[PDB]
């Protein structure tokens, strides 16, 4: 259901089967380059979140390789790689061996998605650094034009990430805010006392 929804939770322990299926998954995970170990990242129950659709996965450093590993382990094929060129308010680049002017977002596909608007946007984003750790808001527009009106889910999102058509998961969100009747019903059953442990 259209308006933003979110679950404050530990993504390692939430039973995500209650959430249903999504046209798009996005994650800006805390790779161990509070972080998650490689094994914890590998063990995330991504496979149950989609049958046919796309994954957007931010990577940096050795997670350029580890994120590819997770991607394939979760059942995705990497079919694009978005590059975010980091600028200031005057559109100049924010300048080990080389200075880094960009961040990478791997794009995975699972199944055979039908009815997506592939090819409308290009794979370079030019956008201003806001806070440290934030990713540009432009990615939501790209994803919306790609798959308009469909259900989407973000993992490790923060309050600024909540968006219409998105369910946002993360341990820095404020409580639980669910409005999709299917999801509310399955959440009550799975978590009658509202507690997400173990």
């Amino acid at each position: 259901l259209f308006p933003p929804q979110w679950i404050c939770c530990d993504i390692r322990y939430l039973d995500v089967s209650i959430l249903g299926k999504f046209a798009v998954v996005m994650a800006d995970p805390p790779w161990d380059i509070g972080t998650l170990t490689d094994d914890e990242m590998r063990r995330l129950n991504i496979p149950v979140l989609q049958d046919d659709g796309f994954l957007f996965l931010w990577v940096t450093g050795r997670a350029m390789e580890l994120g590819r590993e997770c991607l394939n382990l979760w059942g995705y094929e990497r079919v694009d790689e978005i590059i975010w060129v980091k600028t200031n308010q005057l559109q100049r680049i924010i300048r080990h061996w080389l200075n880094h002017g960009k961040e990478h977002c791997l794009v995975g596909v699972k199944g055979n998605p039908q009815g997506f608007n592939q090819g409308l946007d290009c794979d370079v984003i030019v956008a201003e650094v806001r806070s440290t750790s934030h990713k540009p808001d432009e990615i939501y527009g790209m994803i919306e034009r790609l798959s308009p009106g469909t259900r989407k889910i973000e993992l490790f999102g923060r309050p600024h990430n909540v968006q219409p058509n998105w369910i946002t998961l993360g341990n820095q969100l404020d409580g639980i805010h669910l409005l999709d009747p299917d999801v509310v019903a399955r959440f009550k059953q799975r978590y009658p006392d509202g507690i997400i442990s173990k």
Binding site: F54, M64, E65, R68, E77, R78, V79, D80, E81, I82, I83, V85, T87, L90, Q91, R92, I93, R95, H96, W97, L98, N99, H100, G101, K102, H104, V107, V109, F116, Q118, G119, L120, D121, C122, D123, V124, I125, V126, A127, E138, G141, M142, R145, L146
Partner: protein, 239 residues
């Protein structure tokens, strides 16, 4: 405030709006350290690379991928190259991987040849002068050059205008990035061309029209006292 939306509306790529896209002397020492250009025509699929000696400090590998055209080398062919047999125990690779499956298979290659990736250099192509793989989700507007290391003021971005159709040349700026690293003087460009021959580099490829390569002449550029020069320091004084 949304060059992605702008690109959808007008066809102008977001990179077209990046602006502004003490530096020399180091360049001048690089030029003084540079060996004469050496080059050899060789059909690399039929050619035993181990004839190329001594072992190289830097390998720039530029196989002609089919995606460049819209004899091509597949990632099957490239991965079977015996790159580890000619790389020095401490040495660097720069691999042009295109924009498709090469981003993954190129990493497989690097690991197969004994490297770990330290950098991902993205050649971003503007379309200021003219505002599709079936698996593609987005219009592809860049290429990746992966940098690998084996053993124990530049940015990871090159921005130029998209070259004319049928032009498969990569931006010469990659050579400046590599040479500013000061990695050594034995530098090999595989699948280079007449148009890419360059001081300080040995170019090997099928389309070269002439050769001047001699293994004993080549080796003598790196004989003592010059065995360990970075390529960024003064020549060692003689007689």
């Amino acid at each position: 405030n949304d060059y992605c939306q702008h690109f959808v509306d007008t066809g102008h790529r977001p990179q077209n709006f990046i602006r502004d896209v003490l530096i020399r002397l180091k360049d001048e020492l690089i030029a003084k350290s540079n060996t004469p250009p050496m080059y050899l025509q060789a059909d690399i699929e039929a050619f035993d690379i181990r004839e190329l000696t001594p072992k190289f400090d830097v390998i720039l590998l530029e196989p002609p991928l089919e995606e460049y055209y819209r004899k091509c080398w597949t990632w099957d062919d490239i991965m079977k190259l015996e790159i580890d047999e000619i790389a020095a125990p401490r040495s660097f690779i720069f691999l042009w991987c295109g924009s498709g499956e090469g981003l993954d298979l190129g990493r497989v290659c690097l690991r197969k040849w004994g490297y770990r990736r330290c950098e991902d250099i993205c050649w971003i192509k503007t379309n200021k002068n003219n505002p599709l793989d079936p698996k593609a989700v987005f219009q592809r507007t860049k290429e990746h050059c992966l940098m690998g290391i084996k053993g124990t003021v530049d940015i990871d971005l090159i921005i130029t205008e998209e070259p004319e159709i049928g032009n498969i040349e990569k931006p010469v700026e990659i050579f400046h990035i590599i040479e500013h690293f000061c990695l050594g003087r034995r530098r090999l460009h595989l699948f280079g061309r007449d148009s890419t021959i360059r001081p300080g580099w040995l170019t090997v490829g099928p389309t070269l029209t002439n050769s001047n390569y001699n293994a004993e002449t080549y080796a003598s550029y790196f004989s003592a006292p010059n065995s360990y020069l970075t390529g960024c320091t003064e020549e060692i004084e003689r007689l």
